[PDB]
Amino acid sequence: DGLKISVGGVIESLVSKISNIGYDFYPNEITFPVEFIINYGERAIFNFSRNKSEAEKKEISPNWLTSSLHDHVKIDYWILVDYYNNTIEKGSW
């Protein structure tokens, strides 16, 4: 019974870890650097998901981070849209 953490459950733990720390901090962009948290979080879930099955690649929500940053961390979808434009324009994507 070596607990096979689901691709859901890794995302559910990571989303909770990002949101609950973000709630106490944002709009402190020193201690919650939104563009870095997006650019590394999406890259780490990309790297973790790449080698997964085309079944496990259906546990992954396409708005896994972006929903929780709005619902819980109280970041605007307008602000998130240009932080994701910056992520795609500046980063190794």
Binding site: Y23, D24, Y26, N28, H70, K74
Partner: peptide, 17 residues
Amino acid sequence: SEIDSKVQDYRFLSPHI
């Protein structure tokens, strides 16, 4: 201690509160 974030929660309440 919560004021910084409660001044942000208010911006993502619905316009009915």
